[PDB]
Amino acid sequence: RDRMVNHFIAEFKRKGGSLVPRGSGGGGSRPWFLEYCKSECHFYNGTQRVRLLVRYFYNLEENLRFDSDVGEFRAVTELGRPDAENWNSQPEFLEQKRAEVDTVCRHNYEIFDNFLVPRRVEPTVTVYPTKTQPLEHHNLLVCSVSDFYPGNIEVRWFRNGKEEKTGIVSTGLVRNGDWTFQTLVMLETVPQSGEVYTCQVEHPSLTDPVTVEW
Amino acid sequence: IKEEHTIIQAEFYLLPDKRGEFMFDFDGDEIFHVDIEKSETIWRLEEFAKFASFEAQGALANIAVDKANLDVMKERSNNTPDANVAPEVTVLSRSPVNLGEPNILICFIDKFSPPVVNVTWLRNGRPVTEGVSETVFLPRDDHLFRKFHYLTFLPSTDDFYDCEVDHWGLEEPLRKTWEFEE
Ligand SMILES: *[C@@H]1O[C@H](CO)[C@@H](O)[C@H](O)[C@H]1NC(C)=O
Ligand SMILES: *[C@@H]1O[C@H](CO)[C@@H](O)[C@H](O)[C@H]1NC(C)=O
Ligand SMILES: *[C@H]1O[C@H](CO)[C@@H](O)[C@H](O)[C@H]1NC(C)=O
């Protein structure tokens, strides 16, 4: 158990003027209005160096943002300017956001470094063909690598010895939403006698690679 | 070594629907989200609850301001309601599908906006309400949303499943069919 997670505090936007609108699509479209915001704490190496980036949207487009590196708000589109200018004129606000790299970004990292960061789950490696009966093209050797976390991993198919670096139909890293990844690395080949196929999976939960021959 | 990570605090408020949202993301996965109504923190994985604590009022307060801002913003642009971007659907299993061994079908609605959808799971033609769960509206790198839907299913040789997505930007609800194949 760690401390309590901090959050970025919302500021009221001084109304501003009114901008002559660009447009809006219709033809099977119903009217909607969305005020959406994203405060991205970007850690390059833990809390050593961090980059904050707050991105304010509205309907289909980002219209204002606050980059750690720039140090002030910037209009991304005209709609955001009235705000960029106002918030930028509030010196006290500009320091708030500036301190947020710490009071929020780091404060929360530190906490999360206790459970989230080190979360690891070994992948259940699985090999098998899609053997039909005919086809001719030849049923691809499916090396399903499932339920692992973090995402980063390396799955290699080997043709008896060397890294068969081709015909590797893959899904890429698939994300299930319940903090578990998976990926099928399928090898297009013609299974014949006297040759065993291998799947070599290296992962941050694996000290040594997992290899499944077939 | 070197730890590269990103935590995001994404929040929104959407009219006419009068429904907001306040959540945190860790390298792409929901750490947790607040229930603006019930006013409670809902960790993505319950085990989290034993490591950190978010005072759920915090969210309620930010949404209060995001509620204000939207009325400001909606005025600053003549109440011009942008278009609706129809979502892309895709049904896949949560892990290898063996006959008889319990699994889950993931219904991934991706790249859409506004953040509102009607998703329905159909087992053998009928709507399934038991053994179904969904995630809140998850952020993307861009301005669009993705949201996951799950259905616990028993890999049978006899069945078939569909996911029905209905969004204010689709002419007719979309329906991707999944079905065991061997
Ligand atoms: C990253 O941070 C760690 C301490 O958190 C330390 O090894 C050093 O500052 C950085 N390491 C690398 C390999 O950059
Ligand atoms: C402008 O904004 C007003 C809000 O009072 C709205 O009634 C009207 O439809 C919008 N469009 C134009 C062209 O005025
Ligand atoms: C289906 O969902 C709502 C009710 O929850 C309904 O009023 C509307 O026609 C559909 N919603 C969307 C977002 O298409």
Tell me the residue range of the domain where B41 lies: 3-81
| DSSP element (H, E) containing A86 | helix A81-89
**Do A124 and A74 fall within a single domain?**
no
Ligand 3 centroid to Cα of residue B167, in Å, is 7
Return the structure tokens found at B122: 């159909």
CA atoms within 13 A on the CB side of B123: 17
- CA distance linking residue A44 with residue A63, whole number of Å: 26
- Residues A155, A159, A162, A163: what is their CA dihedral angle, to the nearest 10 degrees? -30
If one counts the domains in chain A, the total is 2
Residue B61 tokens, joined = 């307060």
Examine the fold and report which residue of A119, A143, A162 is the final residue of a domain before the chain moves on: A119
Residues A124, A120: Cα–Cα separation, whole Å: 13
How many residues are recorded in chain A?
A: 214
**Amino acid at site A133:** Q
The whole-angstrom separation of Cα A26 and Cα B102 is: 44
Where would I find the H helices in B50-116? 57-76
- Measured CA distances, A166 to A130, A152, A153, A156, A157 (Å): 18, 21, 18, 10, 9
Residue A52 half-sphere exposure toward CB, CA atoms < 13 A:
25
Question: Under 8 Å CB-to-CB from A190, ≥6 apart: which residues?
Answer: A138
B149 and B60 in a single domain? The answer is no
Owner of token pair 């479209």: A29
How far is the C-alpha of A85 from the C-alpha of B130, rounded, in Å? 51
Task: Determine the residue of chain A that is closest to B142 in CA distance.
Answer: A62
* A45 C-alpha to ligand 1 centroid (Å): 6
Q: Are residues A102 and A184 in the same domain?
A: no
Domain boundary among A119, A149, A164: A119
Question: Does B53 lie in the same domain as B99?
Answer: no
Instruction: Tell me: do B33 and B103 sit in the same domain.
Output: no
Residues B64 and B87 in one domain: no
Q: Rounded CA gap, A144 and A182, in Å?
A: 7
Q: Contact B50/B74 with Cβ under 8 angstroms?
A: no
Nearest-CB residue to B9 (from A7, A112, A174): A7
Exposure b/e, B63-91, CB count within 10 A at least 16 = b: bebbebbbbbbbebbeeebbbbbbbebeb
Q: Which two tokens stand for residue A159?
A: 């043709």
Does the beta carbon of B170 lie inside 6 Å of ligand 3?
Answer: no
Work out which ligand 2 atom sits closest to the CA atom of B79. Answer: 2
Please give the resolution of this entry in Å, rounded to 1 decimal: 2.7
| B25 DSSP β-pair partners | B8, B30
- Tell me the torsion sign for CA atoms B141, B143, B144, B149: positive
Residues A85 and A150 in one domain: no
Q: Which amino acid is at A86?
A: N
Q: How was this structure determined?
A: X-ray
Task: Count how many domains chain B has.
Answer: 2
